């Protein structure tokens, strides 16, 4: 009956438990104390980007490491050339409450989401000169909270009503619909490889699926409040989460574990992004007390602290290059720091 | 630089004077969060001054107000509710006709009043069964004391206006409710944000311009308080 | 996508003719527009620019005071000829180009109407006359008296191709980048004050006229016009 269904339930859950207990022999912090700190990184910023007219919700860096899409809950989306500090483009959108923007690798479609239920991808290369609304997504039964480009045809979104879905664009149906979050998924983060991406949820929880026709691979769970942020790592084999409990926690995929946790005892904010240096030595997460802060991703402290934003810092992203690390504000500014 | 890096700057130029023109527009229009129930008239307000999000903009002295009614969401609201921590009011609707369903009313605007993101924000409170609510109150079925006891323990204040001089046994019943709901936006959050009640009836007219009057109230209190006045 | 124009004929010597572009399919208002002339069987040569808007416009050195204006309603460019020169009996096409980065500027070129009337980096293109066959291999050389390598890395050489009885169609941008709808066969390469473009497997709707771009300086320079009489 469901007596025995959910004593099932929770011996593999007890069995996973163990097996990962098992499989736990040193942490991060012992295989990490012999190599020699990262020194007091000190970043400045170089280009403050200025125009949005409200909070700026999401941002995404293009794969050129030059061209930025920054969100903005006026229902703005803009796309800029950050070498230059100009204004690429300025598409409208038909909601005003976006909380998410995606860039495509090749650069020709730009991805748009939020409360209106609907992803939107823009074309940016048409024949008549202005950026269109190209595909209209329709199926969310709640607020699209992230969105992610892994080619030119297909999307793959995280929306309030505890789903994910891989779309093809051209015919505007979900080709794949991932179920198994009991709450708001807020951020998912794509493979390098793109085959797999995780996704953190409101429910203290981030599930690994696999895009190519399949189902929740791995389950990461200990974080106590809700994850708002996600992030790779550049190898893809492990990835960054950052939760309002001020916690932003390493997880490894090939063992299903908790690798190290970047907090302090003086930071109780939340954390709204997180985001990998190139190398994958610093972990960058922007946190509500209106700061960034920088981490020596192997040895758990802190490594810097950019502190020039005045409200809070919504989104991150490091170019592909790692040139740069972009950090959007609530005060509807996008600052440049390298 | 470059003659296409001088037409790039132009570029830039003639996008930040668009923005500039939208932003004149944005900040001349103060958005309202319609959050209320299912049982409450929120769909039948907003067809009376007339997926997703729902945007109804109207205009009552030449200054535009465009309230935002949520639609298809899913039952928890911790997360988008951040969306809105920059609108000018929350326009709450309860509806006062079924009794039943005004506890667990009653358990949500303490969950918008004290809850962050939101300190700043005032709450504009819709009562709007004022017509259902006296055709349940003038016969015996309906019993305020049954679904909510402690009723008795209560006398209409000396700040009462009975409007068409209404019927006793109801201006009562309003003003109970009224009570309640003050009570539970009094003892908290003082000084940052207000709550702000209306007795109304879904076809009734003057609801966008009981939403002017609040919205006054609400800027001229945040402007007040800009300088070091109140 | 079309960009057509009237206004032309047989003027007098007098100096005194309105001529004008209509553009449908189009941004128009957000696209940047050329005047560029041709001479009867003769090369090409840069006329006037209007920027995004307007504020930003260029002329030659032997049109300056052949004044240029825009219509965005009615998505209009005109040209007023002051003068009738002899020398100006040349066809004359509109261009559509904008400037942001990572665009292709005279992407789409309208139909030249004909008019018959009764510092300047020099472009050099030796060779007219390339004799080929159908699948073999053309390569065209263009030389460039200054240095199209800005600082930022961005040269700034275009190669048009113009068939006989046919307006010019945009072939390589930024002597790298290949036009939008064009066949993977062109190729560009050089170092600097040289360069080449290749066509590979040749396929008889290549043969016609090639022209090189410089787009440094705002007077615009032309190549002298390599034809592949096939």
């Known amino acids: 009956e469901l007596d025995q269904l959910r004593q099932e339930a929770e011996q593999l859950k007890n069995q996973i438990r163990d097996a990962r207990k098992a499989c736990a022999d040193a942490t991060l912090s012992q295989i990490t104390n012999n190599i020699d700190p990262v020194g007091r990184i000190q970043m400045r910023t170089r280009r403050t980007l200025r125009g949005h007219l409200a909070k700026i919700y999401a941002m995404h860096w293009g794969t050129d490491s030059r061209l930025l899409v920054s969100a903005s809950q006026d229902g703005k989306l803009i796309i800029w050339d950050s070498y230059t500090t100009n204004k690429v483009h300025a598409i409208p959108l038909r909601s005003s409450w976006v909380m998410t923007c995606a860039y495509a690798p090749s650069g020709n479609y730009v991805a748009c989401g939020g409360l209106d239920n609907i992803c939107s991808i823009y074309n940016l290369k048409t024949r008549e000169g202005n950026v269109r609304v190209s595909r209209e997504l329709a199926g969310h039964t709640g607020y699209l909270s992230c969105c992610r480009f892994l080619d030119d045809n297909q999307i793959v979104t995280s929306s309030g009503d505890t789903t994910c879905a891989l779309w093809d664009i051209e015919t505007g149906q979900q080709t794949t619909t991932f179920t198994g979050h009991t709450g708001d998924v807020m951020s998912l983060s794509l493979a390098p490889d793109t085959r797999l991406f995780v996704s953190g949820a409101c429910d203290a929880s981030a599930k690994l699926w696999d895009v190519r026709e399949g189902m929740c691979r791995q389950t990461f769970t200990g974080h106590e409040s809700d994850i708002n942020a996600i992030c790779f790592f550049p190898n893809g084999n492990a990835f960054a989460t950052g939760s309002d409990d001020a916690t932003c926690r390493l997880f490894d995929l090939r063992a299903d574990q908790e690798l190290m946790t970047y907090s302090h005892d003086n930071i109780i904010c939340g954390i709204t992004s997180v985001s990998f240096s190139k190398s994958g030595r610093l972990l960058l997460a922007g946190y509500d007390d209106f700061n960034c802060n920088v981490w020596d991703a192997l040895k758990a402290d802190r490594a810097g602290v950019l502190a020039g934003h005045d409200n809070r810092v919504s989104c991150l992203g490091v170019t592909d290059d790692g040139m740069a690390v972009a950090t959007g504000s609530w005060d509807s500014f996008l600052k440049i720091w390298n | 630089l470059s003659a296409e890096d001088k037409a790039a700057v132009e570029r830039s130029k003639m996008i930040e004077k668009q923005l500039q023109k939208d932003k004149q527009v944005y900040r001349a229009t103060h958005r309202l969060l319609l959050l209320g129930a299912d049982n409450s008239g929120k769909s039948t307000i907003v067809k009376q001054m007339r997926s997703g999000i729902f945007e109804t903009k109207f205009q009552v002295d030449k200054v535009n107000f465009h309230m935002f009614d949520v639609g298809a969401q899913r039952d928890e609201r911790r997360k988008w509710i951040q969306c809105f921590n920059d609108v000018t009011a929350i326009i709450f609707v309860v509806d006062s006709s079924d009794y039943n369903r005004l506890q667990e009313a009653l358990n949500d605007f303490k969950s918008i009043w004290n809850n962050r993101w939101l300190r700043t924000i005032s709450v504009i409170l819709f009562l709007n069964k004022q017509d259902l609510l006296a055709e349940k109150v003038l016969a015996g079925k309906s019993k305020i004391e049954d679904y909510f006891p402690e009723f008795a323990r209560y006398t209409t204040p000396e700040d009462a206006t009975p409007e068409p001089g209404e019927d006793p046994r109801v201006t009562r019943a309003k003003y109970f409710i009224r009570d309640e709901f003050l009570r539970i936006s009094t003892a908290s959050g003082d000084g940052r944000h207000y709550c702000y009640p209306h007795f109304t009836c879904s076809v009734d007219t003057e609801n966008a311009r009981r939403i002017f009057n609040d919205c006054r109230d609400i800027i001229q209190r945040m402007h007040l308080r800009q300088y070091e006045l109140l | 996508v079309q960009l057509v124009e009237s206004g032309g004929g047989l003027v007098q010597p007098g100096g005194s003719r309105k001529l004008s572009c209509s553009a449908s399919?189009?941004?128009?208002?957000?696209?940047?527009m050329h005047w560029v002339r041709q001479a009867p069987e003769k090369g090409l040569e840069w006329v006037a620019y209007?920027?995004?808007?307007?504020?930003?416009?260029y002329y030659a050195d032997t049109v300056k005071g052949f004044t240029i204006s825009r219509d965005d309603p009615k998505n209009t460019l005109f040209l007023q000829m002051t003068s009738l020169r002899s020398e100006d009996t040349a066809m004359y096409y509109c261009?559509?180009?904008?400037?942001?980065?990572?665009?292709?500027?005279?992407?789409?070129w309208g139909q030249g109407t004909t008019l018959t009337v009764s510092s300047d980096i020099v472009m050099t293109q030796a060779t007219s006359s390339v004799p080929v066959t159908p699948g073999e291999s053309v390569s065209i050389s263009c030389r460039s008296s200054?240095?199209?390598?800005?600082?930022?890395?961005?040269?700034?050489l275009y190669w048009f191709l113009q068939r006989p009885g046919q307006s010019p169609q945009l072939l390589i941008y930024?002597?790298?980048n290949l036009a939008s709808g064009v066949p993977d066969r062109f190729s560009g390469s050089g170092s600097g004050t040289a360069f080449t473009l290749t066509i590979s497997r040749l396929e008889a709707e290549d043969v016609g006229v090639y022209y090189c771009?410089?787009?440094?300086?705002?007077?615009?320079?032309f190549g002298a016009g390599t034809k592949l009489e096939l």
């Open positions: 261009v559509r180009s904008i400037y942001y980065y990572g665009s292709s500027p005279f992407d789409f």
């Open positions: 399919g189009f941004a128009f208002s957000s696209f940047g």
């Open positions: 209007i920027s995004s808007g307007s504020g930003t416009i």
């Open positions: 200054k240095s199209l390598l800005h600082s930022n890395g961005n040269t700034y």
């Open positions: 930024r002597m790298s």
């Open positions: 771009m410089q787009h440094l300086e705002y007077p615009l320079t």
